[PDB]
Write a protein that binds this ligand. Sequence first.
Ligand SMILES: O=C(c1cn[nH]c1)N1CCCC1
Length: 185
Amino acid sequence: HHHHHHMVHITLDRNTANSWLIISKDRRQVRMGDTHQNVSDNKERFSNYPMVLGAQRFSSGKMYWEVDVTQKEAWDLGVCRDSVQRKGQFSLSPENGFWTIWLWQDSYEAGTSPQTTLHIQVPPCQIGIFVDYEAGVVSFYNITDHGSLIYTFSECVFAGPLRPFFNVGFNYSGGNAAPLKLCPL
Ligand SMILES: O=C(c1cn[nH]c1)N1CCCC1
């Protein structure tokens, strides 16, 4: 792809984080802690899952960023509406305001309803995410495999400002402690 010139500097919004997450000083990395991280509750925090939003809001234009997923067993990545549900149980779908892909149990899937199987020959260590607001497109790229396309959501109905979306996943196995990291431009 040739989307690299739309690169944006994303930072994580601490206030939106699940209370078990640990965000680095530079707000560019996040991981699952082994306990509650001693923060007050608020209406923005994702309560049920290890999720956090980017601070940036997008309502126009073309945006691109990259995320490091090295040695993780489970994660979700993409964008979501600013007004997505924070509390309780929900599925990741465009109907609920999410445009995402994930790794789970050794398979990659796009967060459609129902979910779509992805075909990845080279397990990615870094993912590129491209949003074209006006076109209604969210695309995912395999940076480890020379930028090859993973998935495109088209005919997106954003219906609001968009925020970068992250889920570090649970660590029931002891094999998923590694962070998500926003990669430098
Ligand atoms: O944004 C949407 C959508 C949201 N509500 N209804 C449709 N889609 C992305 C892929 C095709 C459906």
